[PDB]
Symmetry: T
Subunit: 62 residues, 12 copies
């Protein structure tokens, strides 16, 4: 059985690095992370631009 | 990194109060709740009407 | 077996009351109404504002 | 011909009043506003809760 | 309040049995499981075919 | 001209048999049923599991 | 309250005339038809081409 | 950079001519109109039928 | 088994004729074309307007 | 690089077997088939019922 | 109240830089730009590749 | 007439380079490639991360 968590990664560099920010957090706290699907992307526009990529990160349960 | 939980709040008064029911539960159990996005709304029709609002409630991890 | 009818309720007060307007019409004419799912919401803007909530109203056949 | 603007209204009371906040802004600046369609709803969760309703507000050109 | 987890069940027999695989895992670890909604279905095609059914499994919190 | 009714069939065996439950009800009450399109699938989880398949069932008018 | 029926009109001439085929059927059998929304379009390709336009046709109840 | 405006053209003849009604309005008021994407189609059913086609009309900024 | 190809037909006359442009190309090169489903429509706006209709054209394999 | 073909499998038994009908056709004609994603399901209702499952079948190019 | 404009940024380097191209144009002409949501991405394939990212860019009115 | 193929490009560097991986494969085997539309993005998480971008790559037939 796989389960997915819905995470939004951030980066001041690019949408790819914001996806990796989420995946790095998932791998810090979960075992058997196996893939991620991008569900939304956006940019927070303040003092700097922060690219955000929301991913469903799938991991295998057990 | 933000994470979202998918909660359905209920109310016998209105869709806004059913969104707040979910958010109040998230704030009981999670720190750093920052926003909610409505994903579905419906009404359970029994002895009384129960308005339901499903929200993805985002909180900042750490 | 359940069947759904696609109704748009109206109210000059709120989206929740326009959902209830549709459900009240369904319960006038159908037996065994059991739930409603909101599919669209809008506002007709004329002499007054009329909030509209479109619902699929499910009822059990028999 | 109708044209739509994509506005997000806010309210600390309810999703219906946040839709009306957007419509009131459209009617301040545009003539012949004729309807609004809700496209998204959410809640900003800070010191207080601010309900937000995003609407495409249609007005007739001429 | 209900909460949903996003699980992908697997089966080498059918999409219905892969939905039940997810639900059986949810019932192993959560109380008050009340319904599941199918969100995606697919087949992993290797040495054998593994049917997969992804479900949001809802359970009542408390 | 074809018209569609939105029915949810149920079965304690499988999603295919819950689609057939809806179609059997449509054929009991309507003439010239010609096809069905699956629009949603889910499982009610109580004393037993009840698989549900919602279909738009098309029939030719006349 | 408005209710919608889901009809597929046909024409061997064009998608506009297949929408009108559905609307003409609705007006034959229902009072107070007020608008139609196109939901799908397609072409049946046999001895001749038959353009099809599926519409939700709204009528006011009473 | 391109920008899109969301316009609904009307015609008593056909959906193609209602798309052209919107595009003709865009070309009256904007320079460098380059394409349009159909996003919705419908028919207003009153004394006469008025076909409507909503388009995002893209134009190049500068 | 049916297979679909994703084609965009063009016409300087109408969206129906741009669907037929795609279907005519499919019938030039494939046997047993049986139906087409419209998936997108748009207009290229240059020296002239070119209406485009994208269709999934289904044909039976064998 | 993976490429997907859009196939509709059929079966008089079940939606799972109609997915396998498509996959069996893909494996007859393509090398390195690796997965399939269900995109639509329906039932053709004639002398018998024919369950149909449309899948995007992915295969690795080379 | 926030309003969004629908802009397509371009870059010959990457999808992130094409999002920034749109945002830079919005900040040239609008005050109080606060966020952008990616709605579509594509690549124009001519003499060179031009990555395009379409964003709804939100700004606060006043 | 344009036709689209549905390809998933891969890269261990970024989503933009995985889109270019698909486009480079299309240009190896097809003439008159003219644009690509991103339809899905994801990351395969194994020994290394492999970013994947699925594109519909359009080419002009003739
Ligand atoms: C993708 C994205 C979506 C957002 N949507 C909203 C929104 O819907 N409402 C709101 O008050 N603030 C929002 N915000 C917050 C704006 C806060 N201010 C800022 O970024 O300068 C959003 C931010 C991001 C990055
Ligand atoms: C939004 C909403 C959706 C529902 N969908 C279903 C459903 O798909 N199937 C079912 O057996 N019961 C359902 N139910 C449960 C009906 C249970 N009875 C009742 O509300 O009187 C649903 C209830 C709600 C509020
Ligand atoms: C949600 C909503 C959607 C509408 N869409 C349309 C529409 O697409 N076209 C049209 O002529 N009139 C429309 N109308 C009717 C405008 C009629 N005039 C008015 O409300 O002052 C719509 C009305 C509502 C409430
Ligand atoms: C509907 C809604 C969506 C939002 N989405 C985002 C978002 O995607 N990213 C972000 O940094 N901040 C967001 N925000 C901003 C969070 C800012 N903080 C706060 O509300 O306490 C969003 C706010 C709202 C109301
Ligand atoms: C529904 C489904 C979707 C998949 N999507 C992908 C995918 O997008 N990319 C990838 O490298 N592998 C995938 N895979 C993994 C292919 C691994 N190999 C195999 O199944 O023989 C997917 C598998 C399944 C069952
Ligand atoms: C597909 C499906 C969707 C449902 N959605 C809801 C729902 O949104 N809210 C609710 O109160 N009950 C629901 N229910 C009813 C739960 C009633 N209890 C039970 O099944 O043990 C749903 C049931 C089904 C089968
Ligand atoms: C829009 C459209 C969709 C169709 N989809 C299907 C379909 O999914 N399966 C099937 O067996 N036949 C279909 N058909 C029926 C093909 C019957 N034969 C024919 O048109 O020569 C469809 C027909 C139309 C017009
Ligand atoms: C596509 C379309 C959508 C519409 N949707 C609505 C609607 O949602 N609510 C409403 O009061 N009136 C509507 N109307 C207005 C009906 C006004 N009366 C009429 O057309 O005779 C709509 C009109 C059109 C053309
Ligand atoms: C439906 C449609 C969509 C289009 N989308 C795009 C697009 O997203 N980006 C771009 O550079 N050019 C586009 N184009 C090309 C504009 C080329 N110039 C012209 O039509 O005068 C599109 C054209 C059409 C017909
Ligand atoms: C899923 C499915 C969708 C279909 N959609 C259509 C359709 O949109 N129009 C049409 O003329 N025939 C259709 N058909 C064909 C009906 C042909 N007759 C029959 O099945 O007895 C469809 C068939 C299937 C299985
Ligand atoms: C994302 C994207 C979408 C496009 N869609 C279309 C389209 O639908 N029709 C058309 O004639 N040209 C198009 N074009 C224009 C092709 C113009 N030629 C070229 O890019 O070499 C599109 C271009 C882009 C970048
Ligand atoms: C976007 C993406 C989607 C995937 N979806 C699935 C999936 O739905 N089921 C499965 O068994 N494997 C999958 N996989 C395969 C996991 C194989 N293992 C791995 O990547 O370590 C997917 C892979 C990718 C990149
Ligand atoms: Cl989710
Ligand atoms: Cl419906
Ligand atoms: Cl828009
Ligand atoms: Cl496709
Ligand atoms: Mg930096
Ligand atoms: Mg009360
Ligand atoms: Mg009042
Ligand atoms: Mg207050
Ligand atoms: Mg076995
Ligand atoms: Mg049994
Ligand atoms: Mg003729
Ligand atoms: Mg006339
Ligand atoms: Mg001409
Ligand atoms: Mg049999
Ligand atoms: Mg360069
Ligand atoms: Mg590297
Ligand atoms: Na989730
Ligand atoms: Na988002
Ligand atoms: Na729901
Ligand atoms: Na219906
Ligand atoms: Na509507
Ligand atoms: Na939003
Ligand atoms: Na999936
Ligand atoms: Na459902
Ligand atoms: Na259809
Ligand atoms: Na807009
Ligand atoms: Na519309
Ligand atoms: Na398109
Ligand atoms: Na289909
Ligand atoms: Na686009
Ligand atoms: Na395809
Ligand atoms: Na995918």
């Amino acid at each position: 059985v796989f389960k997915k968590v819905l995470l939004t990664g951030t980066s001041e560099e690019s949408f790819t690095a914001a996806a990796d920010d989420a995946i790095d957090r998932a791998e810090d706290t979960l075992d058997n992370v196996v893939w991620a699907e991008v569900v939304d992307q956006g940019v927070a526009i303040g003092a700097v631009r922060t690219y955000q990529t929301e991913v469903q990160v799938a991991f295998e349960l057990d």
